[PDB]
Every structure is written in C-alpha cells, then in structure tokens.
Amino acid sequence: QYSPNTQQGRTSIVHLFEWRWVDIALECERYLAPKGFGGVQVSPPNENVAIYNPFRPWWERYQPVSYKLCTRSGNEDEFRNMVTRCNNVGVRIYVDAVINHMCGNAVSAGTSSTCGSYFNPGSRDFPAVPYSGWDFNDGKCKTGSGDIENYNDATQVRDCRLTGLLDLALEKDYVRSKIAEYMNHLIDIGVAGFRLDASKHMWPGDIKAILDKLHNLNSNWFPAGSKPFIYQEVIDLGGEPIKSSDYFGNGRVTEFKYGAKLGTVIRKWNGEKMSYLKNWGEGWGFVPSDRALVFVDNHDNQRGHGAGGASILTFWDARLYKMAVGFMLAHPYGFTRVMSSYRWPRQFQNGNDVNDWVGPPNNNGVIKEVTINPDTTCGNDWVCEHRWRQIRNMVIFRNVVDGQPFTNWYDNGSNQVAFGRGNRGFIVFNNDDWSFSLTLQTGLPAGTYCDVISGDKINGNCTGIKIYVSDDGKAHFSISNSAEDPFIAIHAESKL
C-alpha cells in the first residue's frame, strides 16, 4: 500500500478538485501524460447529498448518500471512460474514499441527492447502500451529544460523529464488506489507489480489516500483485493523543505538518527562515519519508480554517506559493501531491472567509467544463496551478532527479538557500529582502542549463534565464528580491 503505482519516472499526483470526469480524461491525454504527471486525485465519485441552503458547497461531497458512481462530476460511464483513458496514457486515478461516515444526522430525508436515491438520516436509513440503524455507532459513542467533543479522548474521536456526520460502525464485517464492495468496484474499474478521508476518525485496525478485503490492481494495466496505493488523511499536528504513526501498517499518511511549517517558514512567521530547512523532513518531527504524502495545501486548508490555519500558502499567494511548491518538488522527502483549484469570491470578514463554502464554477448547479486558453492556462474560473510553468516544470524536475540524494546545501544564515539532487538537479532560493549574487557548487556536469522557473528549454534554446556550470561544478546565480519568481531551478534535461 505504500507504492504509488505510477509509471517509473512519474513522481507526483495532482488533485483536480471538483473536476468533471470528462475534463480529467481529456486532461490526462492532452497534458498530464506529455508533461510527466503520475496521476490524479479525484473528488469523491460516490453519490452525495445535494445541499441547497448554501448553494451546492464543495463540502456536500463529503456527505455520502450511497456508493453509486453518480455525482456532479459525472456518472459511472463517464467515470469508467476517464479511468480507462487515463490508464491508457499511463496516468493513474486515485479515489477520495469517504468511508468513515454517511451524511449529517440533521439532513432532511428525501431524494435530495446527486443520483436521486432516497435516504433518511434521522432513521439511519440509506437503502441505496443497504445501511440501517444497525450500521452506525450511535450506541457505541459515549459523549452526551453523540458528536466528537474532545480530541484528548482518542476513543470518542473514532466512535462519535464528526460535526454530526453519521458515523459508520466500521467494526462490523457487514459495513467493512459494503465499503470493500465499493472500493473493489473502483479497483476493478482501474483505479490505482485511494485517499482515505477522515482517517483520524477511524481505528487503524478497522481500516486494516477493510484494506484486507481489497483486490490487487486490475491486471490489464498493472503487474500482478500490485496493491492499491493507500494514503490516509490523518490530521496530526502533535498536540493530541492520536498519532499518525498508529496508521503506518495500513499505508502512507498525509503529513499536515509539512505545509503548515513550510508556510510559516516562507512567510517568515515568528523569526523562521529558509536557512532552517537544511534538516527538513524527519528532523522537523515529521513522519518517515516512505510513509508521507506531502503537499503545500489541500482543498480544505486552502480555505484558511483547516489543518495549519492561516500559515497555509495557496494560489492566492502566487509568488510565495510557487516557491513553496518548488521547494517541495525539489526536496526528496515524501510523495508529492500538487493542488489544482478553482477560484471563488473569497470575502474576508473578521479574519475569516464567509465564502469558503462556495462550490466549483457552475451554471445553475452544473459544474462548468475546463476550458484551455491558447497560453495553456485555464478559463471558467479554474486556476490550474498544475499548468503554471513554474509548477509544471518542477513536477518534471522531481521526475528527472528521482532517487537522487539531497546534497550541496548552501545557506546565507537567513533566507537565501540552495541545494542539489545528486548530479541531476540544482535549485536556488532567495526569500530575503535583498539580492542574491553568488557562485555555488551545483554538483552538475559542465554546460549551459535553462532555468525552468523563468522559462523553458525549447528547440535547443532557453526562453528564460541561462546558467553556466563550469568544469568544477560551480555556477553563478543572480536573483533579485524583486524578480517575478525569486528562485532558479536547473536539471539534466534542461541542459543545452
């Protein structure tokens, strides 16, 4: 469960948050395959509650009604078509599995669901997925409210309702089997793995029992015996009894400390500096690299009130964001997930965004298609960070330097740092309020290299900055604190 199952050489996955299946299928063919992306995390593909008070919020997708592959992203035919087309070009699909719970206990009964299935939260009746009151933790939870009230009690966090979400009795073989039936339908369709939503709210042993019921990947696309990639969404910032290490026997875990600390370092909060990143990784109290799923931001915390708070960097902070994503993609620690978002009317009121609930761009509730502009950016309010030159080229940088050691570290005692990846890549950062002009040891063979941040290598020439490495492996780097992107990256495949 620890291997991503991406093609050799492809080292990242991209979260195409709220994208429709037909648009992801096209994206796999026209961009993800040629640009070296390993795979895509898709939004929950199972039927969810259609919420209309706040109009179709993104979070309605985390309130299941059934396991039918029928959502605003598309139906089962559209989902299968996307998995087949993506797999046919070597780009994998990872499903966001919402398996800890069904919808909120106070949601009204009826057919207000993405596939019209009937459901009655009050009576614990979800007939589309034979689930009844016998399949929930109402009698197991010990809190006075029935909801999670205190994170200092690890039992309560697993057996009670997360903000009222009906909590499935995951100890029951029937419930484990209905979840495995859903996950195996997806594996047999061709998915390569899963993001296990709300993993902190599930017992490590219950997750293990479900994973033990899962098939190996579809043998028409994957080698025999390939186990699905599992990355568990566990929010562990160190202040509670639940530790993400309790989940290592099931697969990888999301390392939320990664984006939180990279955000405080790049924002320079409480005196933090990039020079402090030499020991980035386990040295900062993070999980083992081989169990980490890393990212700068995710769909939830990019809204400001999630794991990491206001320190999280997002596309809204474009300049610093590209630098954070660049550092992440250059550094060997963990398996990287790049975020791809949609723009919404962010409106801050008393320190909080009152529009953080806004769902994807839409016409009367129907998600808008992703349009591609001649300059390769996206229209219809899709941000497409994965298409930004500075991010896409760093996704390729990670591929080129795959397996290469962290070496040749340099720092000015403040925010000007640099490091290489063996003899395959080198990156330089300037987050100080002054210029960086210095000759550094790069560890790379002599020659002319194109900076893949300010430009590209096209037709044997560089469209942006050019770096000259001499026979001694040294090269001079000049980065003004007022440059569009205060960082330079060069690698074996950007060499002229």
Ligand SMILES: O=c1c(O)c(-c2cc(O)c(O)c(O)c2)oc2cc(O)cc(O)c12
């Ligand atoms: O609708 C909601 C929802 O889905 C989630 C949610 C959060 C997670 O961390 C999950 O893992 C998850 O599956 C769902 O947040 C919520 C928090 C609220 O206060 C109210 C809500 O209505 C939701």
Ligand SMILES: *[C@@H]1O[C@H](CO)[C@@H](O)[C@H](O)[C@H]1NC(C)=O
């Ligand atoms: C490099 O760019 C110049 C134009 O600036 C062009 O004449 C030359 O042919 C390019 N080199 C290659 C190898 O295409």
Ligand SMILES: [Ca+2]
């Ligand atoms: Ca639970």
Ligand SMILES: [Cl-]
């Ligand atoms: Cl996540």
